[PDB]
Nucleic acid binder design. Structure first.
Lengths: 79, 96, 94, 18, 341, 108, 96, 86, 107, 93
DNA sequence: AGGATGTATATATCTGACACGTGCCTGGAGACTAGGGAGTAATCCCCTTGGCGGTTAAAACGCGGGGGACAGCGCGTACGTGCGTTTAAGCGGTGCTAGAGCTGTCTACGACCAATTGAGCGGCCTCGGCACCGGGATTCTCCAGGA
DNA sequence: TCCTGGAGAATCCCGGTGCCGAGGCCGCTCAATTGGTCGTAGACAGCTCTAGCACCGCTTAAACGCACGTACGCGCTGTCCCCCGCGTTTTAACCGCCAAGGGGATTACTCCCTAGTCTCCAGGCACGTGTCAGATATATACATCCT
């Protein structure tokens, strides 16, 4: 139940950075599910890369490669 | 006593958090979540700190973009509050 | 003319496998050839990226397998990996 | 020889309207 | 011809960008020292003396192709039209567009008027038609009730019209992509759809105008020749023939380019023929005293400086001068209104 | 010498192992290509081809036809979740769209 | 006479065209538009027939998908008529 | 450069054609301005694709735009097209 | 032998023409790499770096700071129409977002 | 070990454009990733062009067309100008 | 217009991260050779374009009307704001060791080459699966009139 | 007020006929296979030094929960205008056909340029170190939101 660690205020702040002024009470569980799906995809790709390298550690480069795979190139961590 | 009307602090926080760049989700809970998700794909896995930082940066960027789209959908519906159907429409149009 | 190459004969053989009493039009054959070329390019590019990322100069079956896992959805990936493993095992046997 | 003189929308003395 | 450059104005920029030059300007006309010019999405009214642009009208996406003034009894109205086949009559002095006529469903090549009994407007569009309109008198509220008087069918796309000098309201000449023809525009005949009465023989005719009451100046592309032929003698030689060789008076040597849509003009009071060329020059012919005869003068493209550099290469399409030949305008494909005194 | 078996015969495949090996070696994917790489890639392509063809032939049968036209391939792809995900940014010529009318647009 | 209620023939056309695969834009007008657009990038350009046809297939696919997204947005807005704002919203969320 | 090109071939994408495209997409009612919006969007799309295709054609030192040019352009734009020699 | 002249100096570039040539060669892009491809690529990369840095430093000045930080690169990229299209599917770490509030939310 | 980066060259360009400006570590890493990403894009497009045209060599022509395909309008124009200028200077010397 | 809350700014502190220097060494540059690539010229036939003429489907224009967009209003509730209490996250410091990174060996697999052959491709041709179509069956829509 | 019957338009289904492209066969040629050699990529072992995990204590900022009021979601109602549907007229797409040449595609040749190699050295990276640009803390002036 670590998805609940993404608190209501955390999602509220994320929405605020997105320009959202008023937030419905059902937005929180929807956002938790969305974040979970995104993390599942990215982490699956990263762990596939980590397994290919015969490594038991997930490196920042594995995440970068997964993100680039999904068309979400990330700068500031190498590559 | 003094009491700002609804929406004032909302705009203030919008401005405040668009001015900053610091990660908005707490680091420890997100690390726990990342490890929990990862363990379903391979047990006994170790994460570089930079890896969790990259995951958090990407996740926050994704959520902020999705909230921009959700807010646009809400405005389209002649509404100022964002609701789950807004996120669903945004994601359906995005190809997700 | 100059010999052009396509996967027409192989797609036809596979079709007669799955559905013996059925045919295919030229446009459908072109679509299938395009599909095979596209999946080839995707998997080969992923294998090349894996070799480069791991500082290896060989595209081996391990690279192709990880590329298949990365590119294809879950169940398709599982069946594709099973088929490839079976093919390589049978090839090595002979 | 005169150079080419640019006349932008703000340089017109009057705009014709519909 | 003691002509000197007076202005080089860039006032038809697209997106209001000073960097727009390639856009081509197509037609200009003097109000009955004020000239209206058209090209791109704008119609401009320019004072040739001072160089100030008096008025500008913009319609989105339109590529204006023709403008013409008419003195109405007491407004000097300005007609403009172009790509969209809509004739827009603008009251320039008042500062607004009065009415719009949806004349053609295809692009309108060019417009013309004449000293007809009143308010006539021939419109030549790419649908292979020339329609004669009677725009009527404007009511108290600046509204026009346009009527269709007659439809001319053409074997090709019409490019320029010139009402016959000695009978402007009886017969009309028009230059088309298939050659030149004459159409009977007399109102007493009852039939409303009329084919070409006579097709003249000298290929497209991209320039056409009367030098005097009897002599016609015409040109095509890829011939390096400007033909002068008599209207009176040709019409006397017609009989009943639908195809009639013209009575040629002289030929004038012109640039040999095969490029089309290079139009000519005249200044009858001075016996002048004007036509720009692909090098930006203005070829001038004084045919009063008048083998291919030579131009009396070639006014070379003075290469004015643009953005600090010379505009070395361009093309001039239309050249028009006032009756007294005190001001000559040459329009370029470079968004430059060349003005000469 | 000995008769040639063909690498596809050894792998029990129908797609060309030799041609796939040549394509890997000439596609500039790596300085070296292993012996097992073409076999695996050919097997994967053959399986994907079998899946699409199975679905498309089912579509043709449902459409009372004996030949696969692009419509049948489009139906097969878009009615299968995983193939649709795989061919997400792909447009098939002469394929059309799946029948779908939103509930609200139907008569009340 | 028969005066099918408004919307019935609309649903009928939806069914008719979602059943079929034939291209919906007339061939010669689209060919001319393709040549006109290509003119601004090069002159005296020739087009293989297959090239024009590929452009038309891709263009119709794109427009159909855009109209699906537009319709979803319109229904989100509690509406049945698609309007320019719907296309604008769909294109913005798509990232175009 | 051609001198007097009539940039009016977008109107050839007719109102009924846009309605048919809408119906294939499941649209029931269409507003009047949808047609001009669609024309602009189609112009932008075709401009991007044809620019890429002509760029390939220039690179090949060819003067005719082959179907593979369009396929490569669409692949660039992430719009993979099957059925023309993929 | 003769005094060594760097290929970058010959091309008047600061980016490494030799390193770019090696990367092109050791990257499986083609069997052969021309002598001009590295120069063109180094020039283009140097131009893009200069273009991004100019706007990033302008953004840094506009905030009264001497050092460029990820926020500054974010501002530079997202305030230029052309760069934002080039990096339209790129997320810059610690860049934040451009300040933007929709009109109807304002009072 | 030696971990090659474009840090020194980015610093040189920065001192050419803003002589009085510094750059942070994270900014430098972002710039390094940007350089590497654009390198990969241009190189991949050039490789695709060479493969399409049945050529085994990546000339400056392929790089020029890759820049045209990838970068938007004004950026593409300026990049092509810079590249052709660099090639002209290299050939002359 | 004032009270209050927040924001902006103004300064001092201090500090750790940037940027500069020095030493080393590995990748780059100079010089050279050799062969395959690619430019260039010639030739040829395919495919693009261009025109014409008739036929008919589609577009276009207009007219009437209904139903859907859109504004105005009223109500009820659900979300923003604030305050107080509780939780746990962040920081720091310490300790441990798993495993990521590097090095050396050795060897097995893959590139390369030469000879042989049959798999696949172009071409050619025949017939039957599908396009088309004219008639009947069905199912679907819409309105008038009775219960 | 609602339903049911009836007509009416539309679509689906079915049997007949035809046509051109799928599907099979033939001949050839060049791409894959086989057999062999050689070199180095990488697989595996051994060693080491980071850094990732765990743990513990203290502080305090953030989260949580509850109250409360009001701004808004939304349901309803009415109006009117604009999109649909359908008839009639206008237009030009499209099919078939013929004709011409522009240029793509292929072939033969030949000089150029680039891969590969040996040699030499300086450009760039690692490491070390000093100091000043920016984060932090505390205090005072300016903005503005609600009463």
């Amino acid at each position: 139940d670590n998805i609940q660690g993404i608190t209501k205020p955390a999602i509220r702040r994320l929405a605020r950075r997105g320009g959202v002024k008023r937030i419905s009470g059902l937005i929180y569980e929807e956002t938790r599910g969305v974040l979970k799906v995104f993390l599942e995809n990215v982490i699956r790709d990263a762990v596939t890369y980590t397994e290919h390298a015969k490594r038991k550690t997930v490196t920042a480069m594995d995440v970068v490669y997964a993100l680039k795979r999904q068309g979400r190139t990330l700068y500031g961590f190498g590559g | 006593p003094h009491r700002y009307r609804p929406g004032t602090v909302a705009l203030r926080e919008i401005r405040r958090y668009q001015k900053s760049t610091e990660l908005l989700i707490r680091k420890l809970p997100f690390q726990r979540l990342v490890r929990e998700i990862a363990q379903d794909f391979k047990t006994d896995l170790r994460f570089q700190s930079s890896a969790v930082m990259a995951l958090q940066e990407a996740s926050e960027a994704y959520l902020v973009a999705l909230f921009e789209d959700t807010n646009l959908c809400a405005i389209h519906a002649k509404r100022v509050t964002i609701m789950p159907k807004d996120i669903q429409l945004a994601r359906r149009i995005r190809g997700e | 003319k100059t010999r052009k190459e396509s996967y027409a004969i192989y797609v036809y053989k596979v079709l007669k496998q799955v559905h013996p009493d059925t045919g295919i039009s030229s446009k459908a054959m072109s679509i299938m050839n395009s599909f095979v070329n596209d999946v080839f390019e995707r998997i080969a590019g992923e294998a090349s990226r894996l070799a480069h990322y791991n500082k290896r100069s060989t595209i081996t079956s391990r690279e192709i397998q990880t590329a298949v896992r990365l590119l294809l959805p879950g169940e398709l990936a599982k069946h594709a990996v099973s088929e490839g493993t079976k093919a390589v095992t049978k090839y090595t046997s002979a | 020889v005169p150079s080419v003189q640019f006349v932008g929308d703000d340089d017109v003395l009057s705009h014709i309207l519909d | 011809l003691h002509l000197e450059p007076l202005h080089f104005l860039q006032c038809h920029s697209r997106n209001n960008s000073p960097k727009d030059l390639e856009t081509q300007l197509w037609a200009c006309a003097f109000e009955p020292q004020t000239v209206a010019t058209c090209g791109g999405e704008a119609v401009c009214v320019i004072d040739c003396q001072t160089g100030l642009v008096l008025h500008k009208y913009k319609v989105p996406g339109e590529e204006f192709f023709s403008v013409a003034w008419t003195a109405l009894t007491r407004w000097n109205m300005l007609a403009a039209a172009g790509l969209r086949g809509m004739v827009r009559l603008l009251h320039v002095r008042a500062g607004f567009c009065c009415s719009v006529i949806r004349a053609h469903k295809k692009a309108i090549a060019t417009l013309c008027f004449s000293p007809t009994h009143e308010t006539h407007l021939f419109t030549a569009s790419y649908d292979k038609r020339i329609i004669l309109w009677d725009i009527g008198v404007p009511n108290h509220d600046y509204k026009f009730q346009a009527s269709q008087l007659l439809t001319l069918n053409c074997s090709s796309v019409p490019l320029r019209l010139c009402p016959v000098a000695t009978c402007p309201d009886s017969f009309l000449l028009a230059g088309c992509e298939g050659g030149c023809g004459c159409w009977d525009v007399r109102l007493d005949q009852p039939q409303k759809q009329r084919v070409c009465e006579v097709n003249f023989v000298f290929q497209r005719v991209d320039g056409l105008a009367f030098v005097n009451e009897d002599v016609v100046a015409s040109k095509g592309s890829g011939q390096g020749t400007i033909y002068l032929w008599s209207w009176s003698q040709t019409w006397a030689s017609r009989g009943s023939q639908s195809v009639l060789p013209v009575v040629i008076l002289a030929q004038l040597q012109w640039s040999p380019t095969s490029l089309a849509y290079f139009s000519l003009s005249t200044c009858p009071d001075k016996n002048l023929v004007l036509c720009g060329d692909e090098e930006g020059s203005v070829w001038i012919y004084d045919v009063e005293h008048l083998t291919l005869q030579p131009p009396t003068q070639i006014l070379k493209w003075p290469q004015p400086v643009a953005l600090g550099q010379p505009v070395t290469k361009t093309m001039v399409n239309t050249v028009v001068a006032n009756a007294a030949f005190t001001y000559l305008t040459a329009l370029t494909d470079s968004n430059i209104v060349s003005i000469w005194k | 010498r000995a008769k040639a078996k063909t690498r596809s015969s050894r792998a029990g495949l129908q797609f060309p192992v030799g041609r796939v090996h040549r394509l890997l070696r000439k596609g500039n994917y790596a300085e070296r290509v292993g012996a097992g790489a073409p076999v695996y890639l050919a097997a994967v392509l053959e399986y994907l081809t079998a899946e699409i063809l199975e679905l498309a032939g089912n579509a043709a049968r449902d459409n009372k036809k004996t030949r696969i036209i692009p419509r049948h391939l489009q139906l097969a792809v878009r009615n299968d979740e995983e193939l649709n995900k795989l061919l997400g940014r792909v447009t098939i010529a002469q394929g059309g769209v799946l029948p779908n009318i939103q509930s609200v647009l139907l008569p009340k």
